[PDB]
A paper describes a structure:
Ferritins are iron storage proteins that overcome the problems of toxicity and poor bioavailability of iron by catalyzing iron oxidation and mineralization through the activity of a diiron ferroxidase site. The capacity of cells to store iron in a bioavailable and safe form is a central feature of the strategy nature has evolved to overcome the dual problem of poor bioavailability of iron and the potential of the free metal to catalyze the formation of reactive radical species. This function is fulfilled by the ubiquitous ferritin family, members of which are composed of 24 subunits arranged to form a protein shell surrounding a hollow center. Bacterioferritins (BFRs) constitute a distinct sub-family of ferritins, found only in bacteria, which contain a markedly different diiron ferroxidase site. Unlike in other ferritins, the oxidized di-Fe3+ site of Escherichia coli bacterioferritin (EcBFR) is stable and therefore does not function as a conduit for the transfer of Fe3+ into the storage cavity, but instead acts as a true catalytic cofactor that cycles its oxidation state while driving Fe2+ oxidation in the cavity.
The EcBFR ferroxidase site is flanked by two Tyr residues (Tyr25 and Tyr58) that are ∼4.0–6.5 Å away from the nearest iron, and by a Trp residue (Trp133), which is ∼9.7 Å away from site FeB. BFR also contains five other Tyr and one other Trp, which are located further from the ferroxidase site. We sought to determine whether these aromatic residues are involved in coupling electron transfer to oxidation of Fe2+. Site-directed variants, in which each residue was substituted with Phe, were generated and the mineralization activity of the variant proteins was determined. Y45F exhibited an initial rate 50 % that of wild type BFR. X-ray crystal structures were determined for the Y45F, Y114F, and Y149F variants. These, along with previously reported structures of W35F and W133F BFRs and Y25F and Y58F BFR subunit dimers, showed that the substitutions did not cause any significant changes beyond the substituted side chain. EPR studies of the EcBFR variants revealed that Tyr25 is the site of radical formation; only in Y25F was the Tyr radical not observed.
Author numbering:
A (entry chain E), B (entry chain L), C (entry chain L), D (entry chain C), E (entry chain D), F (entry chain F), ...: 1 to 157
The structure:
């Protein structure tokens, strides 16, 4: 069913955001795993899977609307070298992605693609959940100190 | 069954105390939850429910005694913005409420409302339990330090 | 995640509505219970719990958005002393709350807080359900007469 | 298998009757549901489903006999505005349909379409069951009065 | 609860669309069944049931909003005589219905009937699913040829 | 445990190959899904997951050997526009990856990194399995004709 | 089966390494147990068991190849007096053992004893696992501090 060209361009942009996040979350998870921070490996791995599911939704929607999903152009990763830097980078990526989602959701409504909008609002809800988790972890590092925080990650939850 | 008017007035005063505690404990719980302190969310939420049960008992007793439960007047909440301050505020409210319960229990005996007295003694036992918990948690903060204390709240017990 | 200040103000206004409804529905429930109208106690108690769940959603959303939930200010309760008056009071409160929800939902869209909007639309759906129930019960009182209506409430459904 | 043209015409006429009844029973059911008359919603919904099954049997039989089922022409609905009016309209429709069935059953026999006749006799038995129910309900309204009758519908049976 | 008159008119228009689709899908299903194309009977029957569920939602919503559901006026069916014609007719109907839904969803938002809008977006999501299936089947006929396509329909999936 | 620099460089090269394959297999799967070729969606999705598992092993090994996994640079995808083109592109990618694996396996042996070699030989065994599947499917098109081949993909196996 | 004399000599050298590790890991485990560090007792005990399994494999392979297993000559143990010293000693022993394994694996390949090589590569994979664990624990001591690290060992994982 032929979709709106600009909506498709938005969906590809958002798909691009998800592709960056899949890779960044996955590498972060395995860095945490290497360091023995099992709890962080578990959550970050889950977050990577969440972004994979989002990517899947975008790919399927773009194809339905007769566009071409772009999985070729990968945007900049920002890995970081310690736990705080890594979590802050993930948070910054989530916030940038949320800005893009808000713009796309408004545009989709303007051209009456209400199903694409519905899909995007559900994805935005998930992303705000990730933002909540990341913000909370970063605040916990400050409150209990890094040494206690790291100790709290070595066992699975 | 028409009860003693002054007893009913005490029951409304005690109900008023419970209404403040329900809101204060619930807001505290969700603040702890937002901060990732899952254990404190669980206990404080449970405390809010316990106060709801007490409020229910007062409401049902007042109605049986043919009085009018007052759920309109809400006393002062003292929320606070750090864990120790929040727990100290809950403790202060519990101690104030216990004073009122003691007065009401004595008065109920003097006019032979032994069933209202029995109910209030059970509630006072519950409140002394909350006081014990709050006092103990506050002492633990002092003894192990806030950073260790916070670390100990992140996982559910 | 810092949210839109006016959205947060709407969320506090809506929370305020829920706080009134929680108390009004709960007191109504226990009045019905005292009168032996078990069915009405059950439904109104359930309605009180539903409003508690809504209040929880507002509190958690406001905290995520870095606002301060207001549980201190309690609006006017309208209790009433006969079944029809009580149900009409609940209906009036629901209709007033629905008006406020519509305003908030429109505003949230205008500032692109699509997740708060989604949450509020789900809550509005719940409230229209309560409105439907209340309207229907009031019409049943008229159609079968209050005496038959009361008889129909004494056994739990 | 090429059937008799006039038999197929009768089957299309009867299909037409069923299409009217499906819609009338279904709207009545949901009107009863809106009014809180759960028992009447349940029975009338089931009667709508019964007529749907009858329509299915006519459609399949017409296609087997190499005719063209007519689902395009919809006869007059008579909805009504109160319970007695609605039930009386349903009864009138059933009686009109039974008249048509009797004519078709006789004709099918005369041209030796015994399988179509067998199908129609089964459908007629179902319709007489609906007639019995409707007549009985209408008599109950008179015997116990409308107020009692309505009270008797508010719980599912 | 009194709804917006134009919203109710939209809901009746959409209901009318569903009523056409129910009949068209159902007759198509039984045509496929008569021809031994079991897979197509199964899917098209399921599609007819989907549209019945949509019609139910419209009827209930219209009644809640104190309007009068119109089940009397049935729009034009376009049946078709072979598989490709039938599927293309279903697709054209779905696309026409989607146009009407988009207009209604925009209007509902403008008068703040957010619950009616939410319902319609869910229905539109269902309709786009049907469109996807129909488009895909029509393309399959082209890719593998009609004879192979028909062979693939004789068993249930 | 500090690894050999050139081994780490090989592991990053192979990781790169896996990253291209994950995306190409996944998009191919969803193109097949869009087209209704459920069998091909299922297998190609499974292959994408297999390549994700391979990427995970490379990432974990690189981190153990104290290197930096490179998930930033993404090589050329060759998507294709029809089933045969897509399968041929997947086969060419697998063959190019197998060449790189053979070179890496020989080199790892030469510097005595027998555990990296063991890992790579297992991955190569998996890749030869994919090559077998792709070659077999392409030959099936040749043997039965494209239309028969496509028909054979519509049901899940 | 008459084995290669130098292969047997390598297997005896590696067996010697395992015999030292069995004793060192076991004594370390029980020192940790005495100190109340239950988690470290558990892991180090399991490491001792793993080395016993390795020793068993060498003994059985040597006997198959018609050589004489040497369990008489025990190399130098380096016990250590505190947690960090103990773990560093285990790490040093593992690294020395891995050096010997790499030499043996290369030689076995060169004289075509591929089954001894296969066995040794599996053992080397196990040893690299131990190395990973030891490195990770030593880094955790630095990152969370010794006091936190010790606290984290008192409960079984």
């Amino acid at each position: 069913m032929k979709g709106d060209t600009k909506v498709i361009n938005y969906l590809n942009k958002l798909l691009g955001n998800e592709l960056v996040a899949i890779n960044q979350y996955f590498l972060h998870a395995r860095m945490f795993k290497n360091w023995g921070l099992k709890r962080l490996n578990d959550v970050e791995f889950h977050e990577s899977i969440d972004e994979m599911k989002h990517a899947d939704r975008y790919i399927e929607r773009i194809l339905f609307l007769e566009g071409l999903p772009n999985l070729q152009d990968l945007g900049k990763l920002n890995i970081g070298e310690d736990v705080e830097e890594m979590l802050r980078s993930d948070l910054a990526l989530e916030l940038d992605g949320a800005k893009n989602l808000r713009e796309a959701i408004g545009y989709a409504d303007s051209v009456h693609d209400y199903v694409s909008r519905d899909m995007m609002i559900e994805i935005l809800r998930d992303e705000e959940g990730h933002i909540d988790w990341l913000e909370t972890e970063l605040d916990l590092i400050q409150k209990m100190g890094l040494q206690n925080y790291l100790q709290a990650q070595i066992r699975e939850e």
